[PDB]
């Protein structure tokens, strides 16, 4: 197969949701994951993940640890190859201007990445983690949170988050 | 609550300040008199003593006995001094105690109000979730 039907469908979805599908991006990500995973046990250690992040994106140690903790939902002390590929696709050369619009588009659910708790509500800690992952001003983040919190309970619903993302995408396109 | 204590506390302390510094030189002839037999003389002597005694009047303990011990001053028809201290103690005590208890129960009121609106929003979200569950089920 062409590196499993699940990853083939993921690549098809990425090509349908992005203007450019690149050339062997998934293959390069798999090669980097195999290079990072020394034991080839379909898992990578936190030290290896931090070393790869510092070598590629030159991120801070605390930011790399926070990203690894957010990605490892199993909390087993290791990061899987699928999780590493998902993180690489979420980054997608974040220094580019179009990468901000790509991150605003996010993924098919486009809610669970922000909602680390998983209770269909994103808190101030999740907002701070998102602002650490993607560069945004503190005042702008506070204004966006105030605009999103219509009820004033400081909770972000899935429908409200989808509407806010749609409005942001429409404003960016226009 | 103590975050909500913003202006009422400085209003209280500035009323304490103005009334104490007014009452310093009102019963001046109480402490500054040649009467041998007296025991509350030191109450109205110093500025710090004035602060302590007007705080005592604020707490309203033995105001009767304080007034009788100041009655050993020659009674100048009580036209200005006794009515001043009585008005000060009564007004300050009742106004400040009442204003603090009112604002504290107001704090409890808005605490319960925000709690109740949180549960109301949660119930509305639950109703919307159940309705969207029906919508999804019919959509399969």
Judge whether A161 and A111 are in contact, CB under 8 Å: yes
Q: CB-based burial of residue A62 (10 Å sphere; 0-12 exposed, 13-18 middle, 19+ buried)?
A: exposed
Q: Quick one: resolution in A?
A: 6.8
Residues from chain B contacting residue A153 (CB–CB below 8 Å): 117-118, 121
Q: CB contact, 8 Å: B32 with chain A?
A: no
SS3 of residue B74 by DSSP: coil
Q: Which of A125, A98, A93, A120 is nearest to A109 (CA)?
A: A120
**Strand A43-45 relative to strand A78-80: parallel, antiparallel, unpaired?**
antiparallel
Q: Which residues on chain A place their C-beta less than 8 Å from a C-beta of chain B?
A: 151-153, 157
Q: Which of B121, B124, B130 to mutate to test the interface with A (most CBs of A within 10 A)?
A: B121
Q: What's the angle, vertex CA A12, arms to CA A171 and CA A108, rounded to 5?
A: 45
Task: Output the known binding site of A for Ca(2+).
Answer: 60, 62, 69, 149, 153, 160
Q: CB contact, 8 Å: B110 with chain A?
A: no
Three-class SS of B81-112: HHHHHHHHHHHHHHHHHHHHHHHHHHHHHHHH
SS3 of residue A48 by DSSP: helix
Interface size, chain A vs chain B, as Cβ–Cβ contacts under 8 Å: 6
Q: CB contact, 8 Å: B125 with chain A?
A: yes
Q: Residue B102 carries which DSSP code?
A: H
**Å from A152 to nearest chain B CA?**
9
Q: Which of B125, B132, B133 to mutate to test the interface with A (most CBs of A within 10 A)?
A: B125
Determine, for residues B125 and A153 on separate chains, whether the beta-carbon distance falls below 8 Å: no
Q: Residue A92 carries which DSSP code?
A: S
Q: For B115, name the nearest residue in chain A, comparing CA atoms only.
A: A153
> Within a 10 A sphere around the Cβ of B73, how many other Cβ atoms?
18
**Å from A153 to nearest chain B CA?**
7
- Of B117, B118, B125, Cβ closest to residue A157: B125
> Within a 10 A sphere around the Cβ of A37, how many other Cβ atoms?
20
Residues from chain A contacting residue B121 (CB–CB below 8 Å): 151, 153
Determine the Cα–Cα distance for residues A91 and A99; give it in Å rounded to an integer: 8
Residues from chain B contacting residue A152 (CB–CB below 8 Å): 117
Determine the Cα–Cα distance for residues A37 and A31; give it in Å rounded to an integer: 10
Determine the Cα–Cα distance for residues A110 and A107; give it in Å rounded to an integer: 5
**Å from B125 to nearest chain A CA?**
9
Q: What's the angle, vertex CA B26, arms to CA B24 and CA B29, rounded to 5?
A: 100
Determine, for residues B118 and A157 on separate chains, whether the beta-carbon distance falls below 8 Å: no
SS3 of residue A78 by DSSP: strand
SS3 content of chain B, % helix, strand, coil (to 5): 75, 0, 25
Judge whether A49 and A87 are in contact, CB under 8 Å: no
Residues from chain B contacting residue A154 (CB–CB below 8 Å): none
Determine, for residues B121 and A157 on separate chains, whether the beta-carbon distance falls below 8 Å: no
Three-class SS of B33-61: CCCCCCCCHHHHCCHHHHHHHHHHHHHCC
**Å from B126 to nearest chain A CA?**
12
């Amino acid at each position: 197969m062409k590196l499993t039907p699940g990853c083939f469908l993921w690549y098809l979805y990425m090509d349908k949701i992005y203007c450019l599908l690149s050339l062997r991006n998934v293959k390069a990500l798999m090669v980097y994951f195999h290079l990072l995973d020394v034991h080839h046990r379909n898992t990578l250690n936190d030290v290896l993940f931090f070393h790869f992040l510092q070598h590629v994106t030159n991120l801070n140690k605390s930011q790399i640890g926070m990203i690894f903790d957010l990605l490892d939902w199993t909390a087993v002390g290791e990061i899987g190859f699928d999780q590493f590929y998902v993180l690489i696709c979420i980054l997608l050369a974040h220094q580019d201007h179009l990468e901000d619009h790509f991150m605003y588009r996010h993924s098919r659910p486009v809610f669970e990445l922000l909602d680390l708790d998983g209770e269909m509500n994103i808190g101030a800690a999740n907002f701070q983690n998102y602002r650490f992952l993607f560069n945004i001003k503190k005042q702008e983040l506070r204004d966006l949170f105030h605009d999103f919190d219509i009820t004033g309970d400081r909770l972000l619903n899935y429908k409200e988050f989808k509407l806010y993302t749609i409005f942001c995408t429409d404003k960016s396109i226009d | 609550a103590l975050k909500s204590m913003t202006f009422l506390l400085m209003l209280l302390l500035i009323f304490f300040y103005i009334f104490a510094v007014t009452g310093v030189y009102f019963f001046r002839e109480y402490s500054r008199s040649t009467i041998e037999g007296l025991e509350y003389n030191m109450f109205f002597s110093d500025l710090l003593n004035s602060l302590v005694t007007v705080f005592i009047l604020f707490t309203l303990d033995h105001w009767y006995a304080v007034l009788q011990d100041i009655w050993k001053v020659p009674e100048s028809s009580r036209v200005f001094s006794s009515i001043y201290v009585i008005l000060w103690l009564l007004l300050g005590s009742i106004i400040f105690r009442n204003i603090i208890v009112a604002m504290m129960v107001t704090n409890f009121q808005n605490i319960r109000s925000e709690l109740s609106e949180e549960m109301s929003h949660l119930e509305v979200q639950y109703k919307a979730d159940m309705f969207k569950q029906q919508i999804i089920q019919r959509r399969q």
